[PDB]
């Protein structure tokens, strides 16, 4: 057999991110001990990422490409800190914020940059305050103990509802993955011959083998549904 397209993404020659026109890494300023006001100089769109970024100035002018909540405008004053009040814009630690509210770009570790809840039209919800660890629900469903000192932007991330509209033409998806990375178009494994992929070969196109494989299964062998505790139509539940 040959090495399979799933294995070949590691070696990373043509399968690298197209990172040329990307404006910078989206994160907070570092922590550095109250309250600090910060004007939104402008809000710009970087390629690949569906969200906007908003370039702040903590005037020297110290810059920070923070990811943009919805309802931010140019020449708003954003207020990072503990004793900053509640507006959509402001960047509070999880000690201060009320529970049962939608927050954006929340950090895992303090002073980190921002980790959970970054893509367009997403938000971490806050469940409740234990003592040190403010428990929050992530967009998927999963729940996470996160320390109260670490920061999070208030409100929902901008650019919501982009997949509501379908892309009618193959050309629209060509321009989508030009900004991101080469991973498209996908040739299906059944169509390929036996050497190229596991599902390939045979007189008539069909999978033949069970098509559902363990965590223990090797490189080359992990193809199709990996460790699928259910399959088929998820009716109810």
């Amino acid at each position: 057999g040959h090495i399979v397209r799933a294995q070949r993404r590691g070696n990373g020659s043509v399968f690298q991110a197209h990172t040329h026109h990307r404006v910078g890494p989206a994160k907070f300023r570092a922590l550095d001990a109250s309250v600090i006001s910060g004007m939104v100089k402008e809000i710009i769109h970087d390629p690949g990422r569906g969200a906007p970024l908003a370039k702040l100035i903590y005037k020297g002018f110290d810059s920070a490409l923070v990811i943009a909540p919805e309802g931010i405008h140019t020449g708003q004053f954003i207020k990072c800190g503990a004793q900053a009040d509640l507006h959509i814009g402001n960047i509070l630690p999880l000690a201060q914020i009320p529970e049962g509210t939608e927050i954006c770009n929340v950090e895992h570790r303090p002073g980190d940059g921002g980790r959970y809840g970054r893509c367009s039209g997403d938000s971490c919800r806050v469940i409740g305050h234990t003592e040190n660890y403010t428990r929050i629900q992530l967009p998927s469903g999963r729940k996470a103990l996160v320390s109260n000192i670490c920061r999070a932007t208030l409100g929902i991330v901008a650019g919501g509802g982009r997949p509501e509209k379908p892309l009618l033409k193959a050309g629209n998806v060509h321009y989508k993955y030009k900004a991101k990375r080469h991973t498209w178009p996908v040739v299906c494994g059944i169509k390929m011959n036996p050497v190229d992929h596991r599902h390939g070969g045979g007189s008539h196109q069909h999978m033949g083998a069970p098509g559902t494989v363990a965590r223990s299964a090797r490189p080359g062998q992990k193809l199709g549904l990996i460790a699928s505790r259910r399959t088929g139509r998820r009716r109810g539940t």
Binding site: A68, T101, S120, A158, G160, E164
Partner: protein, 89 residues
Amino acid sequence: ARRTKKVGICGKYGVRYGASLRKTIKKIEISQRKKYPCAFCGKDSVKRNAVGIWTCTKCGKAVAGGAYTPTTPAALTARAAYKRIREAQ
């Protein structure tokens, strides 16, 4: 004269792509081109610049909105949530 009976903005696509998809995009393509009322300078000339971004021309300003309308319903709910908690206490 009106010249298409049914189709509207999706007449550019012609016979392609199915009836159900052109109904769906008819709603969204009308939205993203439409000029919307500005908060700041007041005037009705807020166009879409990029995906999330909505530049007003005459202001010279921008706002972060939705993808295809400047107001997302879910983001508009978040204002009302932080209003009632700030107005309390």
